[PDB]
């Protein structure tokens with residue numbers, strides 16, 4: 001698809017068998033999702049944004065479907081205001097910005 | 100241009116006579132620039148993201164040249180660590196996300 005930006009670029013993701021909504025976010029290096037249970041061991045990470053730094057849980061090699069495209073990679077879990085698909089997974093689906 | 104997302108999508112912008120580097124950010128509703136002086140009347144606003152909220156000054160009808168393309172819109176000024184070009188100005192330069 002070709003997504004214009006007059007509205008937020010919200011898509012449906014499937015993770016852990018659940019459907020969720022998430023934003024395609026070119027300003028985010030990483031992918032961060034709201035609190036949920038994921039399989040496996042996690043590692044600690046600090047990420048920062050507009051209002052400061054938050055601690056999150058890093059899970060690796062997680063299967064996630066983004067608007068119907070399968071991606072496998074790192075997902076962070078923490079207290080984020082919105083589910084964010086960042087550039088680590090946007091590169092896996094082949095997304096580009098065009099103007 | 101077509102901009103791949105292996106790296107942060109940073110471009111040069113010109114605002115208020117000054118050249119600055121800024122991030123093209125499809126996750127941002129608003130455009131937020133580091134503290135600088137701009138002409139005109141402003142109103143205070145709070146904006147939130149990862150980490151919480153910050154206070155900014157809202158300037159209306161500002162002209163910004165984004166990688167050589169002129170756009171006009173609302174610009175928020177305040178203590179951001181990175182200059183952010185959000186959807187309110189990305190629309191005006193005809194930016195789309197494609198996959």
Ligand SMILES: CSC[C@H](NC(=O)COc1cccc2cnccc12)C(=O)N[C@@H](Cc1ccccc1)[C@H](O)C(=O)N1CSC[C@H]1C(=O)NC(C)(C)C
Pocket residue numbers: 025026027028029030031032047048049050052081084086124126127128129130131146147148149180181183185
């Ligand atoms: C994975 S979530 C963390 C993400 N941060 C980043 O990828 C990179 O951060 C940084 C890069 C370089 C220097 C930095 C210094 N101090 C803090 C963060 C920094 C982030 O919050 N990115 C956001 C943009 C941004 C990048 C760098 C600094 C600050 C903000 C995001 O694209 C967005 O637009 N979001 C995510 S939450 C809502 C919305 C957002 O903040 N909206 C505004 C800007 C408040 C309107």
